[PDB]
Structures are given as C-alpha cells and as structure tokens.
A paper describes a structure:
pmcPARP4 is an ADP-ribosyltransferase (ART) that uses NAD+ as substrate to add ADP-ribose onto target proteins, a process called mono(ADP-ribosylation) or MARylation. PARP4 is also referred to as vault PARP since it can localize to the vault particle, a cytoplasmic ribonucleoprotein complex. PARP4 has a distinct domain composition relative to other PARP enzymes; however, the N-terminal region of PARP4 is homologous to a collection of domains found in PARP1, a regulator of multiple nuclear processes including the cellular response to DNA damage. Collectively, the study establishes the human PARP4 BRCT as a nucleic acid–binding module.
However, the location of Phe39 on the potential nucleic acid–binding surface was intriguing so we also considered Phe39 as a possibly important residue. We mutated Phe39 to glutamine and to alanine to test the importance of this region. As expected from thermal stability analysis, the overall BRCT fold was not affected by the different mutations, and superposition of the mutant structures with WT BRCT yielded RMSD values between 0.5 and 0.8 Å (comparing all 763–788 atoms). Mutants F39A and F39Q both led to a shift in the position of the sidechain of K23, which impacted the charge distribution at the structure surface beyond just the F39 location. The loop that bears residue F39 was repositioned in the F39Q mutant, whereas this loop did not change in the F39A mutant, thus leading to visible changes in the electrostatic surface potential. The TM of WT BRCT was measured as 51.6 °C ± 0.2 deg, whereas TM values of 54.7 °C ± 0.4 deg, 54.3 °C ± 1 deg, 58 °C ± 1 deg, and 60.0 °C ± 0.7 deg were obtained for BRCT mutants F39A, F39Q, K31Q, and K23/24Q, respectively.
Author numbering: 4 to 98
Write the structure that this text describes.
C-alpha cells in the first residue's frame, strides 16, 4: 500500500470522531502504522487545524526528520491512489 513503511502520530483531537476513524482506517488499509505519542520511529505527524505543537515537540520533529502534515495529505493521497508530496501539506511551513 501507498503508506508502507510510514509511521503516523495522529494529533487530530478536534476532528469529528468519524473522520478520525476514517483517517486511521485509510492509513491502516494502505500499509501504514500508528504511534500514539510522538517518538523517533514516527515518519509523519498529522495535525488538524486546532492542534498545536510545543517547542519540545518541534525540536523532536526536526531532530528525527518527522514530516508534519495536515489530514488532506492522507485524504488526497488516498483519492489519487498515490503517495503525494508531503511538503505541500505542512501546516508549520505553508506554501
């Protein structure tokens, strides 16, 4: 699946529960893994709009080369049936 070898930390506390679960099932059904809390094994952290990261979290992210993405990264990669450019979906560095 398109998310093989990807490990996602989900910070999507403010999404409707239905959307959170669809995010999870979309990830799991397409080869992806989950990490409850942020750790060095994470390749990705998904952040909804209302969620923020601390300086400590941002430092860990930089150190461990974690990709910060919004839920659209998942939705649109699924929709296009192809892993998209995660750099186009970074809330902490919009383009």
């Amino acid at each position: 699946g398109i998310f093989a070898n990807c490990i996602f930390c989900l910070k999507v506390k403010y999404l409707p529960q239905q959307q959170k679960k669809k995010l999870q099932t979309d990830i799991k059904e397409n080869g992806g893994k989950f990490s409850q809390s942020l750790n060095p094994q994470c390749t990705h952290i998904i952040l909804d709009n209302a969620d923020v990261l601390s300086q400590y979290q941002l430092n860990s992210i930089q150190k461990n080369h974690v990709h910060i993405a919004n839920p659209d990264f998942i939705w649109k990669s699924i929709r296009e049936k192809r892993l998209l450019d995660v750099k186009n979906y970074d809330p902490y560095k919009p383009l």
